[PDB]
RNA sequence: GUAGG
């Protein structure tokens, strides 16, 4: 801990942070109560 | 560009020419004319360049007529979206979805039917709106057949409330829907909505209701350190036993590695036979089960 | 001062306003000779409104029962 | 699929907006949210090169317009005289010729009215063509379509955050800094004060290595799932942070825009869709920074990322300078003298 | 209650052909005792009925029917 | 919400 540089985050930076991407509004299955695929809470 | 963008959308609709029977039937004639034009253009056979450009112009005019019908009937979708508003999806979003349904109906309409476009369209518009309401309204995504099951049982239960003037007993609901009470309770519990954490609970200082409830993933330091002391005492007690005995029991119960080894599985690295290792494992069971190396471990359970 | 009766009446009035808009919509989308007073009205807004006033409303408060005096007060 | 601009830098004080493009806040408000057009780039050198040719074409157009107008006037006069003569010869009633002549001259006046309206249309479109420049707003969409139709391949125009992104990509901030320094060296009044504020922001961009194009974000990050928990609740109920709903909204609207762009759709619907996407993104970063917020359940507004980091209940003043602590207690205090 | 019912005029469509009159409202004894309501977690309410009269000029007929709006706290 | 500080 020496300095907290802050600034504009370019699109390349956001892609770099991302380990993947999201494609659906799905959150969980109503029955299995488990995360869906390629959506929010996507494991 | 104003607040409440729906008002801006209605202004964007503006004043556009409503179509009388002759107008839209002629427009649809031009639509199918452009359709045939683009069909001819798409054919790999060589067409004269001027004829191809003429066909492209006819197709473009057809596209313009499509747009005219779209804009004229934008007013129709806005009314239909109002017909379904107030059910967890935003009004202009419903209007957009109804516009998609209109695009579908328009793409699937002609004057071959002896009726107005609007009567035919109302079906597609309601189709698209109900589909989106079933697929995107709830926080938890409910399948379409489940959506119709829940709303059917809900409306018929409301009808029972209006008729009997009393809360229908669950068996009555089950026979009405014809399914078992088990399905009734299943779908009923599946037919709820979440409560948001960021809600005022009591005073403003209490603030979000999120604070009140504890989690489960948190490692309780008490239990963790209890497990650590159990680990240390257990390792010491094993060390009390002979080296080979402790090793074989540890492999039988994975005290060094998360997966315990089966008896034969221990009889490869050590070079012992599966029954030899079984025998000495039993003797370790005998040696540990004495009252000697049991007082300490009894309190750890 | 809005005594209890006027408050409950105001909420019942809101509920009946919801009922009016609902039944008007139904009549706009209902055929003649198949309309009955039993069928056309939906009782949901009234029951929901009066319920929404007695739960989750500041003026509807938990009755303190420390003593008779705190009661009356 | 369709770029958007980030709410914070705009729709605020002029220090953060910085006047980075010399356009009033009304200009940006009416462009980003779909409503008025922009002239991103013009080949003004190309337009200036071919002025005599286009001027000659316009002159010939006016010449033929006047020729056909004179022909129409001649036809009008012949029609009027013919109907007058034939009805007065007929003599069906006392004064048929006067009535038909009145109708004919009314028709002539109406034809003159359309003549002058089309002349005005030509004049205004031509002078607007002569009024070309970058960063030019065109509120009237019909007028902009006329501009595209009458002349293309010379001016480039656009709508929404895409136009702004193109502008910033093409922007030359160094020349703006130079000319603003010149203005400050010799300037008076309010214009000078505005220039001073602008110099600050352009110099801040120039000294920083980062490009200004960050104004137009393209890929929206997402909060890690744990930080927005859909934690199970006893009783079959569920607990969700509003950020889940905001993300659902934005991803849904992006999906629908993809669906439209895939098929051939009109310009109105796609533009409305992009406006909707911009609205969703802005609500995500800031719910309530513009007009009514996304009330969600309707009882109260929906929380937003920026809303979380601010104020008494925000992150900073409630969970970094004051934290609950283990190993503590509380109780009434009474007086004991012998201590 | 009768006042709020009365101020609600009978609903009139664009044709003004039909009307619903809410003349008389009435109550019934509550089903649950106060002690029973407190013990068993029930909102102490009673039935509230109203006589709705359907009248259409086109039909030229009056159809009276009692309807139940809901349990009233 | 409402009491104490
Ligand atoms: Mg004190």
Curated annotation (Swiss-Prot), chain A:
Regions crossing the membrane: none
Top-rank taxon, per record: Bacteria
Family designation: Belongs to the RNA polymerase beta' chain family.
Subunit text: The RNAP catalytic core consists of 2 alpha, 1 beta, 1 beta' and 1 omega subunit. When a sigma factor is associated with the core the holoenzyme is formed, which can initiate transcription.
Chain's role: DNA-dependent RNA polymerase catalyzes the transcription of DNA into RNA using the four ribonucleoside triphosphates as substrates.
UniProt-recorded name of the protein: DNA-directed RNA polymerase subunit beta'
Organism from which the protein derives: Streptomyces coelicolor (strain ATCC BAA-471 / A3(2) / M145)
Gene that this sequence comes from: rpoC
Swiss-Prot record, chain B:
Annotation: DNA-binding region: 263-282
Gene Ontology terms: cellular component: cytoplasm
Span(s) of short sequence motif Interaction with polymerase core subunit RpoC: 93-96
Keywords, ordered alphabetically: DNA-binding, Sigma factor, Transcription, Transcription regulation
Region (Sigma-70 factor domain-3): 148-224
Location of region: Binds RNA polymerase-binding protein RbpA: 2-138
Region spans: Sigma-70 factor domain-4: 237-290
Transferase as UniProt keyword: no
The keyword Iron-sulfur appears for this protein: no
Biological process, per Gene Ontology: DNA-templated transcription initiation
One annotated GO molecular function: bacterial-type RNA polymerase holo enzyme binding
Superkingdom to which the source organism belongs: Bacteria
Ranges that cross the membrane: none
Region spans: Sigma-70 factor domain-2: 69-139
Biological function: Sigma factors are initiation factors that promote the attachment of RNA polymerase to specific initiation sites and are then released. This sigma factor is the primary sigma factor during exponential growth. Its activity is stimulated by RbpA.
Subunit structure: Homotrimer (Potential). interacts transiently with the RNA polymerase core complex. Interacts with RNA polymerase-binding protein RbpA via its sigma-2 region (residues 211-347) in a free form.
Family statement drawn from the similarity comment of this UniProt entry: Belongs to the sigma-70 factor family.
Name by which UniProt lists this protein: RNA polymerase principal sigma factor HrdB
Organism: Streptomyces coelicolor (strain ATCC BAA-471 / A3(2) / M145)
Shown chain mapped onto the complete sequence: 210 to 510 of 511
Swiss-Prot record, chain C:
Quaternary structure annotation from Swiss-Prot or TrEMBL: The RNAP catalytic core consists of 2 alpha, 1 beta, 1 beta' and 1 omega subunit. When a sigma factor is associated with the core the holoenzyme is formed, which can initiate transcription. The RNAP complex including the principal sigma factor HrdB also interacts with RNA-binding protein RbpA.
Family under the similarity heading: Belongs to the RNA polymerase beta chain family.
Function noted in UniProt: DNA-dependent RNA polymerase catalyzes the transcription of DNA into RNA using the four ribonucleoside triphosphates as substrates.
UniProt protein name: DNA-directed RNA polymerase subunit beta
Organism of this sequence: Streptomyces coelicolor (strain ATCC BAA-471 / A3(2) / M145)
Part of the full-length chain shown: 364 to 436 of 1161
């Amino acid at each position: 801990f020496d300095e907290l540089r802050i600034g504009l985050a370019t699109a390349d930076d956001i892609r770099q942070w991302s380990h993947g991407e999201v494609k659906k509004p799905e959150t969980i299955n109503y029955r299995t109560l488990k995360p869906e695929k390629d959506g929010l809470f996507c494991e | 560009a104003t607040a409440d963008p729906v008002k801006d959308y209605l202004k964007q609709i503006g004043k556009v020419p409503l179509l009388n029977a002759e107008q839209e039937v002629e427009l649809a004639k031009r639509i199918e004319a452009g359709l045939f034009a683009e069909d001819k253009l798409a054919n790999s056979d060589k067409l004269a360049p001027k004829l191809k450009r003429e066909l492209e112009i006819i197709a473009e005019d057809g596209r313009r007529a499509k747009n005219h019908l779209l804009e004229a009937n934008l007013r129709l979708v806005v009314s239909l979206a109002k017909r379904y508003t107030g059910r967890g999806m935003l009004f202009l979003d419903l209007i957009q979805e109804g516009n998609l349904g209109l695009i579908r109906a328009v793409e699937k309409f002609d004057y071959t039917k002896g009726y107005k476009f609007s009567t035919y369209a109302t079906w597609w518009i309601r189709q698209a709106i109900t589909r989106a309401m079933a697929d995107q309204a709830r926080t938890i995504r409910i399948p379409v057949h489940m959506v119709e099951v829940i709303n059917k049982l809900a409306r018929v239960q409301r009808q029972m409330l209006q008729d009997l003037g009393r809360e229908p007993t669950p068996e009555e609901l089950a026979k009405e829907l014809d399914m078992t009470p088990e399905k009734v309770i299943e779908v009923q519990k599946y037919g709820r909505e979440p409560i948001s954490l960021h809600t005022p609970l009591g005073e403003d200082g209490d603030s979000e209701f999120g604070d009140l409830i504890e989690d489960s993933e948190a490692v309780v330091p008490a239990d963790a350190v209890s497990f650590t002391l159990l680990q240390e005492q257990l390792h010491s007690v094993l060390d009390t036993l002979s080296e080979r005995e402790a090793g074989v029991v540890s492999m039988r119960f994975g005290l060094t590695d998360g997966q315990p080894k089966t008896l034969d599985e221990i009889g490869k690295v050590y070079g012992v036979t599966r029954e030899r290792i079984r025998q000495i494992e039993s003797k370790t069971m005998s040696k540990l089960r004495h009252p000697s190396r049991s007082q300490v471990l009894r309190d750890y359970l | 001062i809005r005594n209890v009766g006027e408050l409950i009446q105001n909420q019942v009035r809101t509920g009946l306003a919801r009922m009016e808009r609902v039944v008007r919509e139904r009549m706009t989308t209902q055929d003649v000779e198949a309309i009955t007073p039993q069928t056309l009205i939906n009782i949901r807004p009234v029951v929901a409104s009066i319920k929404e006033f007695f739960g989750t409303s500041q003026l509807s408060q938990f009755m303190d029962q420390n003593n008779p005096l705190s009661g009356l007060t | 699929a369709a770029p958007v601009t980030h709410i914070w830098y705009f729709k605020g004080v002029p220090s953060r907006l910085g006047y980075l493009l010399d356009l009033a806040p009304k200009d940006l408000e009416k462009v980003i949210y779909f409503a008025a057009y922009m002239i991103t780039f013009v080949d003004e050198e190309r337009r200036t090169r071919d002025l005599p040719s286009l001027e000659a074409h316009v002159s010939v157009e006016r010449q033929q317009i006047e020729q056909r107008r004179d022909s129409d006037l001649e036809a009008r006069a012949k029609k009027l005289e013919t109907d007058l003569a034939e009805l007065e010869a007929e003599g069906a009633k006392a004064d048929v010729r006067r009535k038909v002549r009145e109708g004919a001259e009314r028709e002539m006046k109406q034809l003159r009215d359309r003549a002058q309206r089309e002349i005005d249309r030509l004049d205004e479109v031509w002078n607007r063509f002569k009024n070309l420049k970058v960063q030019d707003l065109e509120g009237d969409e019909l007028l902009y379509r006329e501009l595209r139709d009458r002349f293309g391949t010379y001016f480039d125009g656009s709508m929404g955050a895409a136009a702004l992104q193109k502008r910033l990509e093409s922007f030359d901030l160094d020349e703006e800094a130079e000319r603003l320094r010149e203005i400050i060296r010799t300037g008076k009044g309010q214009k000078k004060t505005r220039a001073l504020k602008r110099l600050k922001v352009v110099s801040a961009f120039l000294q920083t290595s980062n490009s200004p194009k960050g104004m137009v974000l393209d890929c929206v990050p997402v909060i890690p799932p744990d930080l927005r928990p859909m934690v199970q609740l006893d009783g079959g109920r569920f607990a969700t942070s509003d950020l889940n709903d905001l993300y659902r909204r934005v991803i849904n609207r992006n999906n629908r825009l993809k669906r439209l762009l895939d098929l051939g759709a009109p310009e109105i619907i796609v533009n409305n869709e992009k406006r909707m996407l911009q609205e969703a993104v802005d609500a995500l970063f800031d719910n309530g920074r513009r007009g009514r917020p996304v009330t969600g359940p309707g009882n109260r507004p929906l929380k937003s990322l920026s809303d979380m980091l601010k104020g008494k209940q925000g992150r900073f003043r409630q969970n970094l300078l004051g934290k609950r602590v283990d190993y503590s207690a509380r109780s009434v205090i009474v007086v004991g003298p012998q201590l | 209650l009768e006042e709020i019912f009365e101020e609600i005029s009978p609903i009139e469509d664009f044709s003004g052909s039909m009307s619903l009159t809410f003349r008389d409202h009435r109550f019934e004894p509550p089903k649950n005792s106060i002690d029973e309501c407190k013990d068993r977690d029930f909102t102490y309410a009673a039935p509230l009925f109203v006589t709705a009269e359907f009248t259409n000029n086109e039909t030229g007929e009056i159809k009276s029917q009692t309807v139940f709006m809901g349990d009233f706290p």
